[PDB]
Amino acid sequence: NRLKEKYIKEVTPSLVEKFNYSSVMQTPKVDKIVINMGVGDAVSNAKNLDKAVEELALITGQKPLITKAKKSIAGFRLREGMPIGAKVTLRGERMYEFLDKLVTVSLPRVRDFHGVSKKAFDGRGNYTLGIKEQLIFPEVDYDLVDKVRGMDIVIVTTANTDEESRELLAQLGMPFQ
Amino acid sequence: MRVNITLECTSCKERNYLTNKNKRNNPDRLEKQKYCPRERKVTLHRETK
Amino acid sequence: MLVPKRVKHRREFRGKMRGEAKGGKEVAFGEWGLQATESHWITNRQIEAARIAMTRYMKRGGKVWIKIFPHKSYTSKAIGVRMGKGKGAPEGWVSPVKRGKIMFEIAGVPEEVAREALRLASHKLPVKTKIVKREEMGGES
Amino acid sequence: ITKPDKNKTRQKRHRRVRNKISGTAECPRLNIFRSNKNIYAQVIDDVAGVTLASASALDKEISGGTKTETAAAVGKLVAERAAEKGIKKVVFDRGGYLYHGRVQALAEAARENGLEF
Amino acid sequence: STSNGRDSESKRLGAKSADGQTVTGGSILYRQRGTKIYPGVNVGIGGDDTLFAKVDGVVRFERKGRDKKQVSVYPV
RNA sequence: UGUGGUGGCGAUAGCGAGAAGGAUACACCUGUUCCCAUGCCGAACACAGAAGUUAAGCUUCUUAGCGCCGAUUGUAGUGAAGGGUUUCCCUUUGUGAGAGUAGGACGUCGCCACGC
RNA sequence: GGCGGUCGCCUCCUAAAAGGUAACGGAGGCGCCCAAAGGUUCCCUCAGAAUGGUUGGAAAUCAUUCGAAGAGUGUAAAGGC
RNA sequence: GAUGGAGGUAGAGCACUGUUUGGACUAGUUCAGAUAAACUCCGAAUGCCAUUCAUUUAU
Numbered sequence: 001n002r003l004k005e006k007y008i009k010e011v012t013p014s015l016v017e018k019f020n021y022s023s024v025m026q027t028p029k030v031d032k033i034v035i036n037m038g039v040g041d042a043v044s045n046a047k048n049l050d051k052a053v054e055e056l057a058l059i060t061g062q063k064p065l066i067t068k069a070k071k072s073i074a075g076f077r078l079r080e081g082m083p084i085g086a087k088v089t090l091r092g093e094r095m096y097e098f099l100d101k102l103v104t105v106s107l108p109r110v111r112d113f114h115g116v117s118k119k120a121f122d123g124r125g126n127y128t129l130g131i132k133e134q135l136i137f138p139e140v141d142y143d144l145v146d147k148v149r150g151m152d153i154v155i156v157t158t159a160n161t162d163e164e165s166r167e168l169l170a171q172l173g174m175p176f177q
Numbered sequence: 178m179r180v181n182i183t184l185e186c187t188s189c190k191e192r193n194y195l196t197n198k199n200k201r202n203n204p205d206r207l208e209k210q211k212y213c214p215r216e217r218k219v220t221l222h223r224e225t226k
Numbered sequence: 227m228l229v230p231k232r233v234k235h236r237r238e239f240r241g242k243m244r245g246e247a248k249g250g251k252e253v254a255f256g257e258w259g260l261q262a263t264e265s266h267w268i269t270n271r272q273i274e275a276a277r278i279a280m281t282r283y284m285k286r287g288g289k290v291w292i293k294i295f296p297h298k299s300y301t302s303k304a305i306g307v308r309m310g311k312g313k314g315a316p317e318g319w320v321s322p323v324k325r326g327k328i329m330f331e332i333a334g335v336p337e338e339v340a341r342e343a344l345r346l347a348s349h350k351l352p353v354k355t356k357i358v359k360r361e362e363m364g365g366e367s
Numbered sequence: 368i369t370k371p372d373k374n375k376t377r378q379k380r381h382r383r384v385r386n387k388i389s390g391t392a393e394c395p396r397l398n399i400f401r402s403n404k405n406i407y408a409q410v411i412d413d414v415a416g417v418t419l420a421s422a423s424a425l426d427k428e429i430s431g432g433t434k435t436e437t438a439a440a441v442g443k444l445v446a447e448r449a450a451e452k453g454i455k456k457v458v459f460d461r462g463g464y465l466y467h468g469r470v471q472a473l474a475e476a477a478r479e480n481g482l483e484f
Numbered sequence: 485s486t487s488n489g490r491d492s493e494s495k496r497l498g499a500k501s502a503d504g505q506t507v508t509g510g511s512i513l514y515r516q517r518g519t520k521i522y523p524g525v526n527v528g529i530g531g532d533d534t535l536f537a538k539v540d541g542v543v544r545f546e547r548k549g550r551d552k553k554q555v556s557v558y559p560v
Numbered sequence: 561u562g563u564g565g566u567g568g569c570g571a572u573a574g575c576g577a578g579a580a581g582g583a584u585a586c587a588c589c590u591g592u593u594c595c596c597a598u599g600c601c602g603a604a605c606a607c608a609g610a611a612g613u614u615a616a617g618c619u620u621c622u623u624a625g626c627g628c629c630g631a632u633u634g635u636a637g638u639g640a641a642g643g644g645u646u647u648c649c650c651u652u653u654g655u656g657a658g659a660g661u662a663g664g665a666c667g668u669c670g671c672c673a674c675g676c
Numbered sequence: 677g678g679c680g681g682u683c684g685c686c687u688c689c690u691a692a693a694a695g696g697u698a699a700c701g702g703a704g705g706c707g708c709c710c711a712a713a714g715g716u717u718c719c720c721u722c723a724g725a726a727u728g729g730u731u732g733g734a735a736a737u738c739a740u741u742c743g744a745a746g747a748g749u750g751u752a753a754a755g756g757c
Numbered sequence: 758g759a760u761g762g763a764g765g766u767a768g769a770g771c772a773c774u775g776u777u778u779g780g781a782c783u784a785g786u787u788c789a790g791a792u793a794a795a796c797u798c799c800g801a802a803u804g805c806c807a808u809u810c811a812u813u814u815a816u
């Protein structure tokens with residue numbers, strides 16, 4: 001779609017030269033994108049995962065999973081298997097459209113332009129964004145929203161050393177500092 | 178809550194089997210397809226009211 | 227008195243010492259040792275009495291290693307009670323010591339202070355003893 | 368990330384198929400290999416540890432199609448060739464695959480041309 | 485005045501036929517809890533882990549790889 | 561011979577470090593029309609393929625750092641037969657460890673297919 | 677002797693490397709539960725730790741890398757997996 | 758007497774669970790040294806089960 005051209009036409013020559021890759025298999029990629037919502041409020045009101053899921057599906061053409069307890073802790077009134085949050089996974093074209101709407105439309109709606117921190121790379125080459133609310137997107141609306149909540153993002157790639165992903169990630173967008 | 182029980186055939190009316198159940202878990206009557214020895218055949222047995 | 231925190235069993239059997247030490251028969255951390263030549267039980271109070279006597283004599287300190295720990299409990303019944311019902315209540319702690327075991331170690335102090343201190347510790351104890359030094363290996367300073 | 372190889376994940380299922388299936392000389396073992404461009408087949412007895420017949424996908428002379436149709440030819444070939452050695456009573460080891468796709472094609476062709484399963 | 489004092493009946497577990505002994509079909513070889521020993525050629529497992537012959541032959545206790553044991557029965 | 565497959569033998573067969581290789585084969589890789597699939601996702605499993613590449617798996621070769629297999633002689637115990645106080649200790653005769661070591665070891669045996 | 681406790685059944689130690697073995701010896705459980713928590717066919721692999729991530733804190737839920745078992749097994753403990 | 762076998766005791770060991778002494782360290786793992794009846798990576802002497810076996814013997 002939009003970036004396969006961009007890879008095979010701007011970036012793969014760059015990255016293949018910057019680290020002197022003897023093969024093109026060696027060039028990193030983007031494998032997944034996984035979205036998280038930590039609700040933690042089906043504890044009280046059962047009608048909270050519902051809105052979380054409505055918003056996340058307004059984003060992407062995909063009904064999200066439902067993550068449950070996985071154990072029972074009394075600090076949060078948790079039994080086992082109390083459905084807590086929802087998640088989504090994105091392959092192929094769902095990833096490039098979503099990255100494009102992240103870099104070119106949605107993200108800059110956030111003010112105080114701190115972009116993306118750099119203590120955010122796991123030490124192995126995958127990256128995780130951060131979002132506080134939901135209003136940052138053109139798929140969301142004004143009134144329908146009722147809570148200030150936002151979503152976690154993780155972008156996983158095939159890279160050994162962090163800096164390789166640093167470049168392969170800035171080169172496609174994601175306006176770092 | 179657990180109670181012993183008898184399952185009775187539905188064509189020849191012979192109480193062929195003894196078994197259990199929990200009657201707050203299963204409120205209605207059990208129903209199984211069991212070999213009936215009088216007719217040498219598999220038949221719908223049902224629990225005695 | 228030394229006491230084990232948190233035993234797993236409240237009572238246990240007693241026997242059967244049948245002397246010969248299984249473990250530390252050489253000096254490990256100090257320069258001078260106190261080695262038992264008979265086999266007997268050694269209690270909390272005997273160890274503390276020996277330790278206090280040994281440390282008081284060494285003005286300017288030095289160092290002292292206690293190498294014997296009471297793991298095993300006692301029991302006992304009371305006067306005026308006939309034989310019969312289950313074991314008595316536990317009263318005490320002990321360690322079994324078999325002949326060969328080094329029990330204390332001292333360093334940082336010349337011979338005579340160390341020898342006098344080990345002499346004073348042994349009169350507090352129910353065993354016969356020798357005094358030993360680190361003798362000869364690949365390295366003994 | 369580390370994608371695992373598929374061949375080890377199917378060795379791990381093959382070793383559990385084989386806790387039941389095994390082949391003697393009255394009832395040899397019809398095995399199957401399925402690679403990215405072929406499928407193979409051997410007829411194996413295990414007390415002696417040997418092969419009694421075989422047929423391979425695109426090694427010898429099969430072609431006339433390159434859909435699943437390559438498999439049915441191999442099934443028919445091992446059927447004929449094993450009936451040449453006095454063999455009718457084999458047992459089918461799937462490998463670790465499903466009895467579903469182009470392994471089912473080979474198996475079916477085996478059952479039409481001489482081998483009772 | 486003690487609160488102990490109870491036990492269960494002993495169960496007579498162990499080996500019931502020897503290595504190198506001839507045996508008729510169906511005879512018990514070993515009573516156990518769980519598979520301390522495993523079944524081998526011509527031997528079955530019961531409902532509570534007992535091992536039995538299926539065929540008449542001699543009994544041979546063997547080694548199953550590195551850390552397990554096996555019983556087999558071999559007819560003449 | 562080389563490679564693919566499928567088997568026996570207690571890892572002496574394993575782990576980690578290092579190199580090399582694409583002849584066929586093995587793989588990664590490319591797609592979702594059709595058989596089938598995701599408690600979301602063609603990721604997997606299923607199928608249609610053959611642009612691209614030896615980077616990763618795979619194969620071969622070097623390495624005794626980690627595991628594994630370890631003798632010999634000395635002890636500790638203990639069958640029989642005897643002696644002191646009998647808590648415990650000792651002497652004859654037979655058996656003999658666990659530790660700790662000298663050494664071994666980077667597999668060995670077999671069937672099928674194709675290529676040289 | 678009385679008062680106190682105990683009286684059937686299961687698991688461990690005592691018990692002396694087959695089986696068996698006392699004491700008002702040392703420790704615990706049972707008098708049920710499950711219509712699936714039974715049968716069978718396919719498929720799967722755990723507990724933790726470290727790193728990042730908005731609410732969210734040590735610890736709910738996401739991603740990666742180490743991880744032979746340090747988990748689970750309706751219910752006591754042993755033997756198994 | 759010879760040959761095969763089942764089994765965890767006497768040792769002694771710290772891989773697993775309890776109990777425990779010194780030292781280095783750091784997050785803000787390590788080096789040594791002990792110990793056990795209900796601990797075990799290990800493991801005897803003897804006893805026990807067998808055998809178309811052998812030599813004496815009489816059950």
Ligand SMILES: [Zn+2]
Pocket residue numbers: 186187188189190191213215216220
């Ligand atoms: Zn009837």
